[PDB]
């Protein structure tokens, strides 16, 4: 290799490095240049001819990364070179070839050909390692500009689907999924049918993970309100069992699918976190020793240990008086309109705490 600050002659400088590469690359260096000082011809060469089997030609790749984009197509030639990275399946040095040209530098972003390409690459090319770094700046740039071109949001949905599949961490997969599902019903693939199939997998994730607690997150914003539950998805069949306090519900409502895999253990875990909450928070702070125990239909020192499970959830949390005030504040489970009306209360409640008290504070100082 020789430096980029050697005179350009963009084609010939990028091709003098092909001469240091393979002999196949060299005869298509000479042949590439002697025909014409050339575009696509010269520009596809490193990108398709072998970078033999050792990827220290990151250096001449870097020289290709800035000099293909502007003299010809960026959008087609960025997608070339990236086939190669996924072919060799050594990813750390290809990650430098993706890093150098990530986005917002060396020409123009182009508004998601490059952001699709270079992120489609770095999920596959690298492990989780490289894949992590792009997710903030990607989801930032998604908010700074969403693709008005439909199909590229279907692509950025595909990349979030590659993301949740390349992830084998459940909660990051749940996160990447319920960002993808969030952006799903919001815009693009809605387009009903494309979202209906996804709705099944959402019911898998929401049931299978009881830290996507029952239905709390789905009541917060859009997903249930687009993806039907009284369809044969059976999404609201969770919202059934979520308030109605028994193993009986889910087991009688079966998809024999999800019964097997599945949801078996989490049926009792449902009963726990709903009866503890809808016990506590609709009292609305203090239920007794025996009330909780006969709600949950279980022992005494077991409900002590389950108070600790609820304290490790932080659905309930304070110092707990022993034979009364079993559970108190730190609310986290759904109470849909009870939470709305209490919000509707709150501006009127706050009206003194903001005027009356400040009329004493600001006066005093």
């Amino acid at each position: 290799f020789i430096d980029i600050s050697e005179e350009d002659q963009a084609a010939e400088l990028r091709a003098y490095l092909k001469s240091k590469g393979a002999e196949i690359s060299e005869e298509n260096s000479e042949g590439g240049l002697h025909v014409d000082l050339a575009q696509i011809i010269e520009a596809c060469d490193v990108c398709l001819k072998e970078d033999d089997k050792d990827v220290e030609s990151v250096m001449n790749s870097v020289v290709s990364l800035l000099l293909i984009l502007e003299p010809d197509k960026q959008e087609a030639l960025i997608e070339s070179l990236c086939e190669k990275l996924v072919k060799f399946r050594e990813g750390e040095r290809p990650s430098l070839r993706l890093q150098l040209l990530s986005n917002l530098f060396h020409g123009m972003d182009k508004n998601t050909p490059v952001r699709y390409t270079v992120y489609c690459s770095l999920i596959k090319v690298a492990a989780s390692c490289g894949a992590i770094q792009y997710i903030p700046t990607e989801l930032d740039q998604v908010r700074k500009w969403i693709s008005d071109w439909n199909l590229t949001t279907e692509k950025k949905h595909t990349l979030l689907r590659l993301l949740y599949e390349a992830l084998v961490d459940c909660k990051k997969s749940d996160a990447a999924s319920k960002v993808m599902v969030e952006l799903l019903g919001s815009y693009t693939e809605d387009n009903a049918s494309q979202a209906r199939v996804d709705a099944h997998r959402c019911i898998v994730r929401a049931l299978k993970d009881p830290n996507a607690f029952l239905f709390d997150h789905l009541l917060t914003l859009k997903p249930v309100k687009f993806l039907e539950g009284e369809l044969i998805h059976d999404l609201l069949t969770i919202f059934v069992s979520a308030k109605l306090a028994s193993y009986v519900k889910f087991y009688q409502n079966n998809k024999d699918f999800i019964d097997s895999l599945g949801l078996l253990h989490e049926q009792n875990m449902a009963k726990m976190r709903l009866l503890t909450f809808m016990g506590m928070a609709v009292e609305n702070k203090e239920i007794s020793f025996d009330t909780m125990q006969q709600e949950l239909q279980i022992g005494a020192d077991d409900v002590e240990a389950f108070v600790i499970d609820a304290v490790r959830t932080k659905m309930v949390y304070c110092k707990i008086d022993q034979t009364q005030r079993k559970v108190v504040v730190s609310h986290s489970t759904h109470r849909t309109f009870g939470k709305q009306q209490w919000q509707q209360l709150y501006d009127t409640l706050n009206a003194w705490k903001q005027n009356l008290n400040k009329v004493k504070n600001s006066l005093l100082s």
Partner: protein
């Protein structure tokens, strides 16, 4: 030249050990005086010190072993202190060479001899130091033995979990030391510059591959203490790895005297938590929560901890029931006043400027994170910020003329002014 001196010293030591001990003071004194005459003498066809580590190292190790055992034999201690001081001085005036063997030897010896006298804190620190020495000596010593690593990790642990706080009664009384710089000196001795810390220490010497080599008698005992929750199961959970390690003879009997204090330290960890988990608890419930030898013992060890202000409890009470209390009077008596020993799970309490500064910022965040009213205002604050840099770049172009004329002249004029002052 002529060593024989070593033999003489050994004989003297043996004599002191057997017959009278007072001789130690005399012998030691003489030795120190001699070492001072030379080290601070240098004036005769004597030994041409420079790079002759032979005799040097020799005498060193000699006196060391002799002094160490000597003191840690006839129940002496000041002698041992003097010996350590001398060794330190030698290292200071003998730090010109890289470092030969014996080092590890002496280190281990000292850490051991320490263990008890001092707290298992500084002792555990010296233990970890010897462990680190085993690494260097290993790369150079080369020891193919797993059992060794196991013993090492064990010693490390113990010396670590043992005491979560010191009872500074003497200090709390008189003011006040005259009792801290000495600790700093001890730290220096051990090679440290400050004071070791706690199971912190363990984090320290487990940043290394320590979750692994550790022999799994014990691997899954700290996976309770440090890792696993949960107050109402902890004393249960740890009962078995306790019974495991408390069989002593192949696991270093060193460890199993460090264990009872570390058991009480785990109880002490549990006792601090449950003041935030519960607001009261009957003593009869409280008995069943905690597997232990006796209640009559343990209550007094809680009342001790409570009296030494590590928690606040009304364990003594007419009904024989306990009240932790939501705040009552909020103080650092409940909190343990200058150091936790457990996972952070404080419940909410109200202290001065809590509700003040909460109402400042907790309400602010709600208007920052969601808002349709804020970002427009800030985009027009942005516009007043652009305007000020826009006003600025005009002024900067004048300050490029004016402050240039200030800067250059301020080197002359203000110097000429302070010239006339002096």
């Amino acid at each position: 030249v002529e060593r024989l001196y070593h033999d003489i010293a050994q004989q003297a030591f043996k004599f002191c050990l057997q017959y009278t001990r007072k001789a130690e003071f005399r012998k030691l004194c003489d030795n120190l005086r001699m070492h001072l005459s030379q080290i601070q003498r240098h004036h005769n066809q004597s030994t041409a010190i420079n790079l002759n580590n032979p005799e040097s190292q020799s005498m060193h190790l000699e006196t060391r072993l002799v002094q160490l055992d000597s003191a840690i034999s006839m129940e002496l201690w000041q002698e041992a202190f003097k010996a350590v001081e001398d060794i330190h001085g030698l290292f200071s005036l003998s730090k010109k060479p890289p470092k030969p063997q014996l080092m590890a030897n002496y280190y281990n010896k000292v850490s051991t001899v320490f263990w008890k006298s001092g707290n298992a804190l500084f002792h555990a620190s010296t233990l970890h130091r010897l462990y680190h020495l085993s690494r260097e000596m290993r790369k150079n010593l080369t020891q193919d033995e797993m059992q060794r690593m196991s013993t090492r990790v064990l010693l490390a642990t113990l010396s670590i979990p043992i005491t979560p706080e010191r009872t500074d009664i003497a200090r709390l009384l008189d003011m006040d030391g005259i009792i801290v710089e000495k600790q700093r000196r001890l730290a220096t001795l051990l090679g440290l510059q400050a004071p070791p810390t706690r199971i912190g220490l363990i984090n320290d010497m487990v940043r290394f591959n320590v979750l692994q080599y550790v022999v799994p008698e014990v691997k899954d005992l700290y996976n309770w203490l440090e890792v696993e929750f949960n107050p109402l199961k902890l004393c249960e959970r740890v009962t078995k790895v306790l019974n495991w390690v408390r069989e002593q003879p192949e696991k270093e009997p060193e460890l199993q005297q460090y264990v009872p204090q570390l058991q009480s330290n785990t109880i002490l960890r549990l006792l601090q938590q449950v003041a935030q988990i519960y607001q009261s608890i009957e003593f009869s419930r409280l008995t069943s929560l905690v597997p232990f030898v006796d209640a009559f013992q343990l209550e007094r060890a809680i009342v001790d901890a409570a009296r030494h202000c590590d928690l606040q409890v009304r364990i003594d009470h007419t009904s024989r029931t306990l009240s932790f209390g939501s705040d009552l009077n909020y103080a650092t008596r409940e909190d343990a006043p200058i150091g936790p020993h457990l996972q952070s799970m404080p419940s909410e309490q109200i202290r001065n400027q809590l509700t003040a500064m909460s109402s400042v910022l907790a309400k602010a965040l709600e208007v920052i994170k969601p808002a349709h009213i804020l970002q427009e205002k800030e985009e027009q604050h942005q516009l007043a910020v652009t305007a000020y840099l826009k006003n600025s770049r005009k002024e900067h172009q004048r300050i490029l003329a004016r402050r240039q004329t200030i800067e250059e002249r301020k080197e002359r004029l203000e110097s000429l002014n302070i010239q006339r002052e002096k």
